[PDB]
Amino acid sequence: PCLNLSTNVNLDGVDTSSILSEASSTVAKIIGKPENYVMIVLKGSVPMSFGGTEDPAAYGELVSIGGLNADVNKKLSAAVSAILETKLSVPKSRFFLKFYDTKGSFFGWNGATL
Amino acid sequence: PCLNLSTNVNLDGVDTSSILSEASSTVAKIIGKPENYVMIVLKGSVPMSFGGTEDPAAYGELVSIGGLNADVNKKLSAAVSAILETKLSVPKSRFFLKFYDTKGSFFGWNGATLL
Amino acid sequence: PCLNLSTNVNLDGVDTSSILSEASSTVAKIIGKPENYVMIVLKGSVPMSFGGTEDPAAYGELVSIGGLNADVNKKLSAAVSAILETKLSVPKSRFFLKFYDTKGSFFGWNGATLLEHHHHHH
């Protein structure tokens, strides 16, 4: 699966490696897939508005071949939001996370599809 | 809802806050949701090609829990494309905008989902 | 269609226009779409991890009004991954590509939508 994040928080002084690593293991554990198949993308310094203000915020998308449903999505939202609160000071009230369950035939990896 | 935009235009010198504010209010009015729940994301200086050329262009995605249909989508495309033409000189013929309707159980906010 | 890509590789160090042009031609030819309607987006220097490491990687999404199916998607995966291998040194084992078949009425262009008047085709 892939967790693809954008934030207006500037990452120039941040240990992004630690954020990626925590997100990577957290997603693997909750979605129940080996971490070998987990991708995390984190774009910072992205202009954003949420609720009309430019205070720190984040937008994410999480794509997986199956494994996504109301319970898992709630648990992933809680856990990822806690990483963004602690490590980026993005409140969970300013984090939107879109989930997408893709068919394997519509997901490319290793030059082929699933 | 969230409108997530990328453009090859450089935002330096551009009043980025006014673009965000105009887009935020426009999306809120057309989709019919309080602006409290509208997110706008705008990345500039992104390498992109449209039609094989690198003239000003933009790609957007708009995600929402319902409220999307052919009529709403046409109105959103017209309004957002007008912002990009006037504020970034991105011609509407070089702007693609993918609309996605999501279930609330598949949209996270506030540490949970919108279910 | 639009192919929208992110990578941790630094594009200051590569001819980015040649990647855009080769991807644009490749998507047009494999889906079978006029190149006038092909958009390629490429963001670089993006923090990423895949499998817990930060070696070169890429994430993409390809949206198209029709023209996508299991066979075409496999060909697109192979061809686009080969561009990133040769031009960005991103191994195909570190490249994920989501495909999405959209209705025209859910795809804005030219200040309206591409609402379809005939049948949709995979």
Sum this structure up briefly:
By secondary structure, chain A is of the alpha/beta class. Chain A has helices at residues 16-31, 70-88, and strands at residues 2-7, 39-43, 48-50, 58-64, 95-101, 107-109, 112-113. In chain A, the strands form 2 sheets. Chain A has a 4-stranded mixed β-sheet, with helices on one face.
How would you characterize this protein structure?
With 114 residues, the first copy, chain A, is of the alpha/beta class. Chain A has one domain: Macrophage Migration Inhibitory Factor (2-Layer Sandwich). In chain A, 31% of the residues lie in helices and 29% in strands. Chain A contains two helices and seven strands; from the N terminus they run βαβββαβββ. The first copy, chain A, has helices at residues 16-31, 70-88, and strands at residues 2-7, 39-43, 48-50, 58-64, 95-101, 107-109, 112-113. Chain A has a four-stranded mixed beta sheet with strand order 2-1-4-5, covered by helices on one side. A two-stranded antiparallel sheet of chain A has the order 6-7. In chain A, helix 1 (16-31) runs antiparallel to helix 2 (70-88). The B-C interface holds B 6, 43, 46-52, 54, 57, 59-60, 68-70, 73-74, 76-78, 80-82, 92-93, 95-101 and C 2, 4, 11, 16-17, 20-21, 23-25, 35-44, 63, 100, 102, 105-113, 115. Strand 3 of chain A pairs antiparallel with strand 2 (39-43) of chain B, so a sheet runs across the interface.
